[PDB]
Amino acid sequence: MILVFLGPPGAGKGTQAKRLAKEKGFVHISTGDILREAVQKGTPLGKKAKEYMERGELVPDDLIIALIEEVFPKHGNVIFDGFPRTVKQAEALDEMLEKKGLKVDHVLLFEVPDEVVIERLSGRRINPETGEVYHVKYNPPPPGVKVIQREDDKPEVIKKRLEVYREQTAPLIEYYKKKGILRIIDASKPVEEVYRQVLEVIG
Numbered sequence: 001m002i003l004v005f006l007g008p009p010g011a012g013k014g015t016q017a018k019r020l021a022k023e024k025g026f027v028h029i030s031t032g033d034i035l036r037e038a039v040q041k042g043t044p045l046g047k048k049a050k051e052y053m054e055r056g057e058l059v060p061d062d063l064i065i066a067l068i069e070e071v072f073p074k075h076g077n078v079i080f081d082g083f084p085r086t087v088k089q090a091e092a093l094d095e096m097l098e099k100k101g102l103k104v105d106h107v108l109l110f111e112v113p114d115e116v117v118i119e120r121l122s123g124r125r126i127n128p129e130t131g132e133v134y135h136v137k138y139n140p141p142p143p144g145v146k147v148i149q150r151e152d153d154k155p156e157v158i159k160k161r162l163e164v165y166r167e168q169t170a171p172l173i174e175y176y177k178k179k180g181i182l183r184i185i186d187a188s189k190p191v192e193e194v195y196r197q198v199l200e201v202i203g
C-alpha cells in the first residue's frame with residue numbers, strides 16, 4: 001500500500017507518519033527530513049536546497065523528483081510525507097509508480113485552519129540529537145531536554161510557507177479527488193484522535 005499525506009504545514013502530517021511507520025511498518029519518506037539531513041551534511045543537493053527552505057520556498061521539482069527516485073524502496077508499504085507538493089511532482093510520482101506496477105492507494109488530506117497551523121508551527125521544537133518533534137504547549141519537551149526552533153518556523157517564513165502551500169500545493173486536492181482516492185482527515189483534533197482516523201481511513 002502507498003499513502004500520500006497532504007495538507008498545510010503544521011497539520012501534523014509528520015507526527016502521524018512517524019507513528020504509522022513505527023507501529024505498522026510503513027517506509028516513511030519525508031522529503032522534509034531528507035532535505036534537512038542533506039543540508040546538514042552539505043551535499044550537492046543540500047547546498048542547492050538550503051536557501052529555498054530557509055525562505056519557505058519549494059525546492060525545484062527536478063531536484064525533488066530525483067530525490068524520490070533515489071530513495072523509493074524496492075518493497076514495502078510507503079508513506080509519502082510532504083511529497084508531492086506540486087502538480088508536476090504528482091504527475092512524476094504517478095509515472096514512477098506505474099513503471100513499478102504501483103499506484104497511490106490513499107491520499108489523506110490533513111484539514112486544519114490557518115489559526116491552528118500558525119499555533120502548531122510557532123510552538124514546534126526539535127530535539128537536535130533525536131529528531132523528536134515537540135510542541136511548547138501540546139507536547140512539551142521533558143525537563144532538561146534542550147530543543148531548537150527551526151529557522152523556517154519563524155513568523156514570516158510560516159506566512160510564506162502558507163502562501164506557497166495555497167498557491168502550489170493546494171491544487172493537489174482536486175488532482176487526487178478526481179481520482180477517487182482523497183480521504184479527509186480532521187487534523188485539528190488531538191494527536192490520538194487523528195491517528196485513529198488515519199488507521200480507520202487506511203483499514
Ligand SMILES: Nc1ncnc2c1ncn2[C@@H]1O[C@H](COP(=O)(O)OP(=O)(O)O)[C@@H](O)[C@H]1O
Nearest residue numbers: 009010031032052053057058059064082083085
Ligand atoms: N516535496 C517537496 N518539494 C519541494 N520542496 C520541499 C518538499 N518537501 C520539503 N520541501 C522543502 O522543505 C521545507 C520544509 O518541508 P517539510 O518539513 O516537509 O514541511 P513542514 O516544514 O511543514 O514540516 C519546505 O518549505 C520546502 O522548502
Ligand SMILES: Nc1ncnc2c1ncn2[C@@H]1O[C@H](COP(=O)(O)OP(=O)(O)O)[C@@H](O)[C@H]1O
Nearest residue numbers: 010011012013014015120124134135138190191
Ligand atoms: N493533533 C495535534 N494536536 C496538537 N499539536 C500537534 C498535533 N499534531 C502535531 N502537533 C504539533 O504541531 C506541530 C506540527 O506537527 P508536524 O507533524 O511537525 O506537522 P507537519 O508535518 O504537517 O508540518 C508540531 O510541533 C507537533 O508536535
